[PDB]
């Protein structure tokens, strides 16, 4: 029974060594994945806060503008509308402000 | 005597088999983590692209408003 016991012990040792090797390989893969911290988490986390600050600043600044009405908005809108449907400049003569 | 030795050897082999199947199940479920990898790569671009868009927006705001 000595030979069969020796064979069984050797097989068990080989199996446990294979288990150790595969566990080490999985550990190495996990370490490689964690080397960069999965990569984008930190800089996208900072970018989210930066974007939030920029958008809030723009929204706050939007409440301090003053607009001056021009004398060619209607003509430009009419020209754009006439170009959108059956694209062609409107028939002559020219409109009030052709620019 | 020998009966106890062989019985404990069989128990050792059974527990070793259980450990091996547990380890291979652990490896199979660890390699199933790549799902969490889908919302890592592509999403990054979106955020970056969004950043770029916002950036150019600010630039355009400085080309129209008279400001100081």
């Amino acid at each position: 029974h000595s030979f069969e016991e020796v064979v069984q012990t050797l097989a068990s040792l080989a199996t446990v060594v294979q288990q150790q090797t595969i566990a080490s390989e999985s550990l190495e893969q996990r370490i490689t994945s964690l080397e960069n911290g999965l990569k984008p988490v930190y800089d996208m986390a900072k970018t989210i806060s930066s974007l939030n600050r920029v958008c809030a600043e723009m929204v706050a600044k939007y409440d301090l503008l003053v607009m001056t009405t021009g004398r060619a908005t209607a003509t430009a809108a009419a020209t754009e509308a006439y170009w959108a449907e059956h694209g062609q400049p409107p028939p002559g003569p020219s409109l009030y402000e052709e620019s | 005597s020998f009966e106890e030795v062989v019985q404990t050897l069989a128990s050792l082999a059974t527990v070793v088999q259980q450990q091996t199947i547990a380890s291979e199940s652990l490896e199979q479920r660890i390699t199933s983590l790549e799902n969490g990898l889908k919302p890592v790569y592509d999403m990054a671009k979106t955020i970056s692209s969004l950043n770029r868009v916002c950036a150019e927006m600010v630039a355009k705001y400085d080309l129209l408003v008279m400001t100081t």
Binding site: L65, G70, G92 | -
Partner: protein, 1362 residues
């Protein structure tokens, strides 16, 4: 004969540019127009031969070459023209004076008798009543001037005809004044001694035209001077004289009724005001209207100063005083006024400020603004005023615009959710609106307090269209008998060629809406939508947009716009779509007074997140039109386009207006420096410009009102206050609810409420200014209980009387289609009814109406314009002269029997009558009983039935078949149909008006009346929802005599001319009246004999008529008892038992209705002496499937099917009767609509068609002040004798009777507490439940209708299902 018919009333702006031509023909000098082209142009063929007329040369033989403006002389003519001259008119208007007075007296007596018969009468009457009335009528100041001016008006109206060659002139010499007339031109010769002088020695009129040295040399040794004007000034003066006479007569008569205190100002103060205004005008020229315009604000401030007088209540009067002083000092610096004239010119506003009157008297005085005339308008000044505010540069704040747009979208969404079930299925990537998602999933809506941070979230909401573009339910909007502009090709063809100096190369064909609507080959609603969507209004020939000066006003000039035909159609379609699409989310009405509402309801409504005190302030929106720019209104227009299926429809105006050339289409002054060379590209000058950025008044009014409501709602959200808004005319009133705790007394509540109102006003001013529209803080005022809005005036809940606006407009002559007597009398009657609706005095208005009725009758009999001179209507139509007795008898029988009577005393109690026939019969019986001529009732009511069809029966279900009660509508409709027969190449109207339209109409009308029993109201209701109704409403578009006598399409149909037919029908109608005992039969009197009941006799009269229609079938649902005959009053003493309820009420008793008086006073102004001055506490079936956004045709078919199903409930033919009517309207078949028809289950369908459907709203004809001090108990009737009693009319009758009974006695002097109205047992019946039964079917082919409009439409179930 002729194609001209001048009007009798002023309805046009006063322009005197053409007069410069006349003065050049006669050789005089005058400068009325600012256009130098008129100085050296070519005179027309007429007004050039004035140098060949002997009469004109003789008239202008001893006058200087210099003339004076007519606007400096109108007060002088008004003061110095009495009736003492020799007029060419043969029968003078003063000859038939005494008769009128007699008639007036008689009418007054009748009224008294009527009241004494009802039970109202008066307490402690005075025997000397008729003598005072006679003295007041005879002692009027303007009695003879009115007749003289009417003679002048008749002369000038007759003379304006004869458009051909060889025209004649008329002459009048009235003592000092000389008047000459030649074809719409008047020369006045006046002494120079009556003109006020300057410090330089010249009259004030000559300052602006001549220097001091030139005028003195020109005059030298002359005593008379000549002025030239048009014929509109004479009409204006005649209207002024009539208004002054009416006002003075009413004021004088009202003093007799209540000597101690009346509601009218006075009869001597008003004369002083007239004199002061006349002097101010005679000194200051046409610029005195800038001061006359301040009468209304001063009266408003004086009424404002009749309250507790908080610290800021006197700000408005101070501001008005400062403004009037500044204007007075500004407009007189250049003029060299003498110190005496300088002191005497301010008396107008000096008197106005120093008045001390009750608020009612001030409110009555408020309505005499237009009693001084109207200014002379110029094109250049109006163009300069319009050019500013329209080309100015504005500054805007984007954040306010964003918030307003969000509020707009929120309001639309809230209105959609309130009806229609639940949310509108928002599309477009829901995660973009985090916060609204919870509400959408839970299917709820934000209340209001929490919608302040998610306001931006409404920007991202998207939906399919919510409304449909095929809901035009009326085709008369596209044909309305108006005028439009001409094409850009021939824009300058509307001016006179002689003044222009060159003949236009291109000429237009027509200029009227009806003369172009019938010749549009491819007219259709979808065609109009396609035309708008393709931006086809940008074509080079569709940009004219002419201007036109407005009618009588007091400003320097206001202008409206005119568009070519297709753009006008687009504008009309847009307005129609916005009326019943959007703008229902923004209600503008309400008119809620916190002093006349329930306490708990007011508290619940005023709660945002305890007594409630509300304030208010009013703002003016008339200048808002020119302050709208594209940069502000673009998002709203885009959203309006998206809510429908259209693309570029709602922004036609902002796209096509700046590309136009702005000018005023005035016939006698084209734009400056116009020449044949620069015709295609004309220059701009003092009367023209190119760049227009603002809006135009009238166009797109609904959208602008919606934007204003959105702004108000935004302000309401911004500040935590509850706001209600109302918009009417040119004003909007905004009220703010403040809500207060219980322990805050009543002293600081008003102060806090006014503080809150001022806060709201400041916030609204800031917001609107940020939007680009500027409020003026110096005119907006804040009050805490006084509200004036359109036709309503309230002071702390008390309604103020204002009846001089309508009572002073009564006139014998008015435009009523060929001077029809019936039209004039009907207009006078309606004016009298409207006037008596207000105030608390009855006699003055009736006296004025009676005075004017006889005068109109006489002036039409002797001076009809439709015939030649010397023609007498009252002689040849009878063979003998018409006497007073015949006229008096023919003015007493009512119009429903054909009798030219419209002043029904019954109208003094309530407006809408249940049955006109019974009321007319009772009035005739009472009038015949008052005099001792009782034996004429049967011959008067017998008459002879005429010939009529079923169409005439279904037009007026409550009428009779007598030819004398008909109008001119049938004649005009026949003329229009005849014109359509040989015209109207529209290719879509022609389909509707096919060969057999009349036969189909006859068949449908006959079938609708073939039921058993026959009901006429149901037939009339059903008839309007068929193609017959559409044809009928299209046919009736004629409105004036000018378009009848001048239309090209109407007058080119050959045949007999229209004038001869009009003369013949007028002669026939005049023969119908005033004849008597010539059109009556002796077969009906026996049947009507021995009835002694108004209801039975009226039923017999109705059944005898329409005999050829109703063979023997009974007629129901058309007769109702008169309210006076039903009830009798007893006027119970506070401590007294009713004789009716105790002495003769032993066996069963008699039902009655009770009236009791409250004791709480609440508020009173100025005192509680009068009942009218005080108010009291006390307030005055679902379908299985409902379609979304249904079309007009689908809806009409739905109610038609519902009505047919409901009326025929006991029969089994409902499945087959409905189908032929729906085959021509909707594509769906029967058993598909039925699940959409709401379920109805009731009885006594006559009551459903009487009050539940409410063809009339009933309402009262008295002020609502008294109704709050009375309580009416009706449950005492018990079994209600379900009957013929109309409860609303009963309440109105009780309230009106109590009001009239005590209208002069003091509150303490009232000796009666409770009133019992006991019902008689003669005119009260019991109505059973009856259902109509039809024994046949229409079996008519209506499948030929497969066209657009209100006609059969495909795929009606396109909007989905709910």
């Amino acid at each position: 004969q002729h194609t001209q018919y001048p009007d009798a009333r002023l309805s046009s702006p006063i322009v005197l540019d053409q007069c410069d031509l006349v003065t050049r023909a006669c050789g005089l000098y005058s400068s009325y127009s600012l256009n130098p082209q008129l100085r050296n142009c070519k005179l027309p063929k007429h007004i050039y031969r004035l140098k060949y007329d002997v009469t004109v040369t003789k008239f202008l033989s001893d006058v200087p070459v210099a003339t004076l403006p007519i606007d400096f002389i109108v007060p002088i003519l008004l003061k110095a023209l009495s009736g003492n001259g020799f007029c060419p008119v043969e029968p003078r208007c003063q000859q038939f004076l005494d008769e009128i007075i007699k008639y007036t007296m008689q009418d007054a007596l009748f009224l008294k008798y009527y009241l004494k018969n009802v039970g109202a009468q008066e307490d402690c009457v005075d025997d000397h009543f008729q003598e005072k009335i006679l003295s007041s009528i005879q002692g009027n100041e303007f009695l003879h001037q009115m007749f003289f001016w009417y003679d002048l008006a008749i002369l000038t109206r007759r003379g304006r005809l004869n458009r051909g060659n060889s025209r004649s002139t008329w002459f009048v010499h009235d003592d000092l004044i000389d008047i000459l007339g030649y074809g719409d031109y008047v020369f006045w010769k006046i002494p120079i001694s009556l003109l006020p002088l300057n410090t330089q020695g010249i009259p004030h009129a000559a300052m602006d035209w001549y220097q001091t040295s030139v005028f003195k040399e020109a005059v030298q040794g002359h005593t008379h001077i000549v002025s030239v004007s048009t014929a509109d000034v004479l009409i204006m003066c005649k209207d002024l004289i009539t208004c002054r006479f009416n006002t003075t007569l009413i004021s004088k008569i009202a003093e007799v009724e209540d000597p101690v205190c009346s509601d009218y100002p006075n009869f001597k103060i008003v004369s002083m005001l007239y004199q002061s205004g006349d002097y101010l005008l005679s000194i200051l020229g046409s610029d005195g209207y800038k001061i006359i315009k301040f009468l209304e604000p001063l009266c408003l401030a004086k009424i404002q100063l009749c309250s507790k007088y908080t610290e800021r209540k006197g700000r408005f009067l101070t501001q008005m005083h400062l403004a009037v002083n500044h204007t007075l000092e500004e407009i007189t610096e250049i003029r060299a006024l003498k110190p005496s004239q300088a002191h005497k010119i301010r008396e107008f506003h000096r008197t106005l400020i120093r008045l001390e009157m009750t608020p009612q008297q001030l409110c009555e005085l408020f309505s005499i603004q237009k009693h001084w005339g109207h200014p002379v308008l110029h094109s250049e000044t109006a163009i300069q005023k319009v050019k500013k505010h329209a080309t100015v540069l504005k500054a805007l704040r984007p954040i306010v615009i964003f918030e307003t747009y969000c509020v707009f979208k929120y309001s639309i969404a809230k209105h959609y959710f309130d009806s229609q079930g639940s949310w509108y299925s928002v599309t477009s990537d829901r995660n973009l609106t985090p916060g609204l998602n919870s509400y959408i999933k839970r299917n709820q809506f934000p209340p209001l307090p929490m919608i302040k941070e998610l306001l931006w979230e409404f920007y991202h909401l998207d939906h399919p269209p919510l409304f449909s573009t095929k809901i035009i339910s009326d085709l008369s909007i596209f044909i309305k008998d108006r005028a439009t502009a001409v094409e850009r090709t021939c824009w300058d063809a509307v001016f006179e060629p002689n003044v222009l100096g060159y003949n236009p190369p291109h000429k237009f064909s027509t200029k009227r809406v009806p003369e172009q609507f019938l010749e549009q080959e491819n007219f259709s609603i979808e065609n109009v939508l396609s035309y708008a969507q393709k931006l086809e209004y940008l074509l080079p020939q569709y940009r004219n947009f002419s201007f036109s000066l407005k009618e009588k006003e007091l400003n320097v000039g206001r202008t409206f716009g005119k568009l070519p035909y297709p753009t006008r159609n687009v504008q009309t379609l847009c307005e129609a779509l916005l009326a019943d699409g959007l703008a229902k989310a923004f209600p503008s009405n309400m008119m809620v007074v916190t002093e006349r509402e329930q306490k708990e309801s007011l508290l619940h409504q005023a709660s945002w997140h305890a007594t409630v005190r509300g304030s208010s302030f009013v703002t003016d929106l008339e200048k808002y039109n020119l302050a709208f720019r594209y940069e502000f209104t673009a998002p709203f227009i885009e959203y309006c386009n998206r809510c429908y299926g259209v693309k570029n429809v709602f922004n036609w105006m902002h796209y096509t207006i700046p590309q136009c050339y702005m000018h005023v289409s005035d016939y006698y002054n084209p734009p400056h420096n116009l020449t044949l060379e620069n015709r295609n590209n004309p220059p701009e000058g003092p009367s023209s410009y190119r760049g227009h950025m603002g809006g135009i008044e009238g166009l797109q009014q609904k959208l602008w009102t919606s934007i204003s409501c959105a702004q108000i709602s935004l302000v309401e959200i911004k500040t935590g206050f509850k706001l209600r808004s109302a918009v009417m005319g040119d004003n909007q009133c905004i009220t703010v609810l403040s809500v207060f705790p219980l322990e805050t007394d009543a002293d600081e509540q008003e102060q806090s409420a006014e503080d809150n109102a001022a806060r709201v006003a400041a916030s609204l001013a800031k917001v609107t200014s940020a939007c680009g529209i500027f409020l003026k803080p110096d005119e907006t005022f804040v009050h805490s209980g006084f509200i004036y809005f359109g036709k309503k005036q309230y002071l702390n809940g008390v309604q103020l009387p204002q009846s001089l606006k309508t009572a002073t407009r009564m006139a014998p002559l008015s435009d009523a289609i060929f001077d029809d007597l019936q039209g004039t009398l009907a207009s006078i009657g309606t004016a009298f009814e409207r006037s008596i609706s207000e105030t608390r005095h009855i006699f003055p208005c009736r006296i004025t109406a009676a005075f004017h009725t006889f005068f109109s009758v006489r002036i039409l009999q002797y001076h009809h314009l439709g015939f030649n001179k010397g023609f007498d209507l009252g002689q040849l139509t009878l063979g003998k002269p018409l006497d007073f007795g015949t006229i008096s008898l023919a003015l007493a029988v009512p119009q429903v029997l054909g009798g030219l009577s419209f002043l029904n005393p019954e109208k003094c109690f309530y407006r809408n009558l249940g049955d006109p026939v019974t009321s007319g019969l009772f009035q005739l019986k009472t009038y015949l009983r008052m005099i001792e001529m009782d034996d004429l009732f049967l011959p008067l009511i017998a008459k002879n039935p005429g010939n009529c069809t079923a169409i005439d029966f279904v037009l007026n279900p409550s009428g009779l078949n007598v030819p004398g009660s008909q109008d001119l509508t049938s004649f005009l409709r026949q003329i229009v149909r005849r014109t359509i027969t040989l015209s109207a190449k529209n290719k879509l109207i022609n389909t509707l008006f096919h060969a057999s339209a009349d036969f189909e109409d006859e068949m449908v009308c006959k079938w609708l009346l073939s039921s058993t029993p026959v009901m006429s109201r149901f037939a009339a209701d059903i008839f309007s929802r068929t193609p017959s109704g559409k044809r009928l409403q299209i046919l009736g578009y004629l409105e004036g005599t000018r378009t009848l006598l001048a239309s090209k399409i109407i007058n080119n149909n050959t045949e007999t001319p229209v004038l001869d037919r009009l003369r013949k029908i007028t002669l026939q109608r005049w023969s119908l009246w005033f004849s008597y005992l010539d059109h009556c039969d002796n077969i009906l009197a026996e049947a009507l004999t021995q009835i002694t009941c108004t209801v039975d006799l009226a039923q017999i009269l109705r059944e005898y008529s329409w005999a050829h229609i109703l063979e023997g079938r009974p007629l129901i649902g058309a007769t109702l008892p008169c309210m006076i005959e039903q009830f009798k009053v007893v006027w119970l003493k506070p401590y007294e038992q009713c004789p009716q309820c105790s002495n003769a009420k032993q066996p069963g008793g008699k039902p009655f209705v009770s009236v009791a008086v409250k004791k709480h006073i609440v508020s009173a102004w100025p005192n509680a002496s009068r009942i009218s001055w005080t108010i009291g506490d006390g307030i005055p079936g679902q379908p299985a499937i409902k379609p979304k956004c249904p079309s007009a045709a689908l809806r009409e078919a739905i109610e038609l099917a519902s009505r047919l199903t409901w009326v025929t409930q006991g029969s089994s033919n409902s499945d087959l009767l409905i189908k032929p009517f729906l085959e021509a309207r909707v594509n769906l078949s029967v058993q598909e609509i039925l699940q959409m028809t709401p379920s109805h289950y009731s009885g006594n369908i006559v009551h459903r068609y009487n009050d539940q459907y409410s063809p009339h709203s009933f309402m009262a004809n008295r002020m609502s002040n008294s109704a709050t001090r009375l309580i009416v108990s009706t449950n005492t009737l018990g079994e209600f004798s379900d009957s013929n009693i109309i409860f609303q009319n009963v309440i109105n009758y009780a309230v009106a009777l109590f009001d009239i009974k005590f209208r002069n006695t003091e509150a303490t002097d009232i000796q009666y507490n409770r009133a019992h109205l006991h019902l008689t047992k003669c005119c009260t019946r019991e109505v059973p439940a009856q259902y109509l039964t039809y024994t046949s079917t229409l079996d008519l082919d209506l499948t030929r209708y497969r066209e657009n409009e209100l006609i059969y439409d495909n795929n009606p179930l396109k909007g989905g299902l709910n």
